[PDB]
C-alpha cells in the first residue's frame, strides 16, 4: 500500500551539503504530514524535522537549526531535505515517517507517526569510498545431511554499508542468513550470506550474488563454481 521511497545518502566529507528525498506512493499527498527522524545505530532515535499536509514547517531540534532545510512538493509529491555543514555527530539512519490523522484545520497540535520506511545510511567522515570485492566461495563436497552444503559471497573492502543483495532478480525470499558487517580495525567491512544450496543436479540457482553499492556503483555479475 504505502511506499515511501527514500533516496539520497552516502559518504561525504565533513562540511559539505547533500539532498535527501522521500517520495510517497499509495495515498494522496495533500492531507498527511511527513517527518524526517534520524536513528543512531543502537543509540535510540532523534527527530529531525517535519512538514504538515500543506507547505508548512513545524520546527527543528536544538542542534539542527540553521543547517537543515526541509521542503515539500505537492506537484511532484515529494519531501526534500537539504543538509549543510555536516559534522561527525550526524551519522544516523534518517527515516521518513508519515502521519495518521488527516490534520484538520481546527484541532490541537499533536502529530504522531503511523508508517515507517527503510532509511538511508548517511555517513560523514574523512575516509574515502572503496570498491567491493565479490568472491565465489567454494561449495565443498562435504555431504552428510540433505542440505549441509552451502555457498555464499565474500564482499569486503567497503567503508559505507548500503548492503543490498540479490540472487537472480530480487526473489527467493526463503531462509538466508545474511551476516552483518564488522569494522576490522581499518574502517572497512565484510559481508557474507548462507543459502540452502541443495544437491547440485542442474536444478539449482544460477549461483549469482549481485550486491548493489551506491557510493561504489559497479555491476558485478561473476558466477560461482565448485
Amino acid at each position: 500500500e504505502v511506499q515511501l521511497v527514500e533516496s539520497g545518502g552516502g559518504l561525504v566529507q565533513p562540511g559539505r551539503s547533500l539532498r535527501l528525498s522521500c517520495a510517497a506512493s499509495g495515498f494522496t499527498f495533500d492531507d498527511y504530514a511527513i517527518h524526517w527522524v534520524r536513528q543512531a545505530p543502537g543509540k535510540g532515535l532523534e527527530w529531525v524535522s517535519g512538514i504538515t499536509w500543506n507547505s508548512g514547517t513545524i520546527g527543528y531540534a536544538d542542534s539542527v537549526k540553521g543547517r537543515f532545510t526541509i521542503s515539500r512538493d505537492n506537484a511532484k509529491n515529494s519531501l526534500y531535505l537539504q543538509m549543510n555543514s555536516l559534522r561527525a555527530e550526524d551519522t544516523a539512519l534518517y527515516y521518513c515517517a508519515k502521519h495518521h490523522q488527516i490534520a484538520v484545520a481546527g484541532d490541537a497540535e499533536d502529530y504522531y507517526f503511523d508508517y515507517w520506511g527503510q532509511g538511508t545510511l548517511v555517513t560523514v567522515s574523512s575516509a574515502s569510498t572503496k570498491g567491493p570485492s565479490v568472491f565465489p566461495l567454494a561449495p565443498s563436497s562435504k555431504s552428510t545431511s540433505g542440505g549441509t552444503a552451502a555457498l555464499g559471497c565474500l564482499v569486503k573492502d567497503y567503508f559505507p554499508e548500503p548492503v543490498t543483495v540479490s540472487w537472480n532478480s530480487g526473489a527467493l525470499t526463503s531462509g538466508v542468513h545474511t551476516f552483518p558487517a564488522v569494522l576490522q580495525s581499518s574502517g572497512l567491512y565484510s559481508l557474507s550470506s548462507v543459502v540452502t544450496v541443495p544437491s547440485s543436479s542442474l536444478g539449482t540457482q544460477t549461483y549469482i550474488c549481485n550486491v548493489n553499492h551506491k557510493p561504489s556503483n559497479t555491476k558485478v555479475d561473476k558466477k560461482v563454481e565448485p
Binding site: 517527518h35 527522524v37 535510540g44 532515535l45 532523534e46 527527530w47 517535519g50 513545524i58 520546527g59 527543528y60 531540534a61 536544538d62 527515516y95 495518521h100 497540535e109 499533536d110 502529530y111 504522531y112 507517526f113 503511523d114 515507517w116 520506511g117 527503510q118 570485492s133 568472491f135 565465489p136 566461495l137 567454494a138 565443498s140 552451502a150 555464499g152 565474500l154 569486503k156 542468513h177 551476516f179 552483518p180 564488522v182 569494522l183 576490522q184 580495525s185 565484510s190 557474507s192 548462507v194 563454481e225
Partner: protein, 210 residues
C-alpha cells in the same frame, strides 16, 4: 522536554511487563508508543492510552496516571522482543522529544546449540593476496560467545581479528570470525581449522589439509 525510561526490563513469558515513561508535569498531553524490531521497520502500537491501530491485538494497552505512562503487554512471547519507544509532543518547545528505548527480553527461553561453518578460500584468488578466511556460526539464543581460532593446530590470536558482537536475526544471536594472518600460503600443513567455545560444550570443524 526530557523523558526518563528504564535501561532494560526483563520478565518471564508468564506475566506482564512494566514499561514506564514519566516526565515533570505530563498529565494531560497525548502520549504515543512505537515498537521497532531489531533490523526491521518500526510499527505503531496502542497510542493515547485510549485506542489502538488496526492490527494490534488486545494484548497491548496504555495507561496514564498523573505523571507516568505505562505500556502494559499481555502474554508476552518470544516474538515480542523489540525496542519500545514513547513519544510526547511538548508544545512548549515545538519539538518531538524521544528517549532511550527499553529492550524487552523474555527471560527463560530454551537454549540453542550453534553450528559452526567453514568456507575455504575460493579458487580464483590464489594468484592474488587477499587472505580473507572466514568462520561462521549459526543461530543461538545464549549470546556472549568467544570464537577461539586454531591456526596451524595451535592457538594463534596475535593476528588481526574482528570479534563481532552477537547481532539480532529472527530473535536469535549470530556473529562471524575473520583471522587470516597467514602469508597467504594457508595450505601449509597440520589441517588449519576453526573452533568455537560456547558456555558449556565447544564445537570444532576441520577442512581438507590441502
Amino acid at each position: 522536554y526530557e523523558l526518563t525510561q528504564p535501561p532494560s526490563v526483563s520478565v518471564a513469558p508468564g506475566q506482564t511487563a512494566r514499561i514506564t515513561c514519566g516526565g515533570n508535569n505530563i498529565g494531560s498531553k497525548s502520549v504515543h508508543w512505537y515498537q521497532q524490531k531489531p533490523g526491521q521497520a518500526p510499527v505503531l502500537v496502542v497510542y493515547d492510552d485510549s485506542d489502538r491501530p488496526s492490527g494490534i491485538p488486545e494484548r497491548f494497552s496504555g495507561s496514564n496516571s498523573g505523571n507516568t505512562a505505562t505500556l502494559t503487554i499481555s502474554r508476552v512471547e518470544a516474538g515480542d522482543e523489540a525496542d519500545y519507544y514513547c513519544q510526547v509532543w511538548d508544545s512548549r518547545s515545538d519539538r518531538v522529544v524521544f528517549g532511550g528505548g527499553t529492550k524487552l527480553t523474555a527471560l527463560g527461553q530454551p537454549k540453542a546449540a550453534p553450528s559452526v561453518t567453514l568456507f575455504p578460500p575460493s579458487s580464483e584468488e590464489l594468484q592474488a593476496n587477499k587472505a580473507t578466511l572466514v568462520c561462521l556460526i549459526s543461530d543461538f539464543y545464549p549470546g556472549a560467545v568467544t570464537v577461539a581460532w586454531k591456526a596451524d593446530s595451535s592457538p594463534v590470536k596475535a593476528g588481526v581479528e574482528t570479534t563481532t558482537p552477537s547481532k539480532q536475526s529472527n530473535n536469535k544471536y549470530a556473529a562471524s570470525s575473520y583471522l587470516s594472518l597467514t602469508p597467504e600460503q594457508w595450505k601449509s600443513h597440520r589441517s588449519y581449522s576453526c573452533q568455537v567455545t560456547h558456555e558449556g560444550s565447544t564445537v570444532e570443524k576441520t577442512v581438507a589439509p590441502t
